[PDB]
Ligand SMILES: [Ca+2]
């Protein structure tokens with residue numbers, strides 16, 4: 001399948017070079033996989049989700065995404081126009097408030113919720129969790145992310161936007177999950193992206209167009225935008241049978257575009273998520 005005039009990040013995921021505009025991908029499109037977006041919620045009614053999104057848990061007064069961030073991230077995972085895995089099932093877990101903030105106890109509870117809830121959902125091709133969030137180092141947050149991964153979920157987490165070593169941020173610093181840095185359309189490390197030995201992969205994160213609340217769209221930037229490209233890629237590859245929740249991060253690193261990015265500090269991977277789609 002081919003999507004012409006796609007958002008640059010989707011085109012980048014399916015190319016060995018920057019500057020292309022078509023997103024090439026297998027038509028299976030993540031069908032049969034499930035991605036939990038642990039964030040501010042998901043506006044499931046957005047036409048771009050096509051009935052494939054639903055809220056399954058909220059830690060706040062409402063399940064509504066009153067911010068937009070979670071809807072944007074969910075759109076990069078799996079919306080029709082803006083998503084990597086255009087036929088996946090999306091599940092929203094609202095651990096962040098409508099200002100985009102959340103206590104670590106709540107974020108932890110949301111991870112534990114997913115580890116359990118997935119046993120009640122039909123996800124034959126596997127389960128992914130996308131965590132476009134984090135703050136300072138916390139062993140408890142890292143342990144929660146490690147538990148979620150160990151339970152059989154492909155966990156993708158943002159590296160953080162501090163232009164610093166991700167070792168000091170959580171859940172970014174948990175080694176066992178897939179820690180995602182951000183790049184721009186010219187294959188530079190995004191200005192704000194964290195780096196360091198704990199990063200597993202980079203994905204598109206600067207100027208990413210996706211869904212927003214009120215049935216709208218907008219472009220924003222962050223390691224929060226890179227993360228769902230990797231989560232969606234994992235779901236897509238799991239549907240194709242190429243990898244599993246336990247092995248997807250490693251598989252994505254194995255098959256990434258290597259050495260393409262600039263301003264990568266020595267000791268940080270120079271690996272950019274790539275679907276290796278061959279029509
Ligand atoms: Ca290249």
Ligand SMILES: [Ca+2]
Nearest residue numbers: 175176177200
């Ligand atoms: Ca890792």
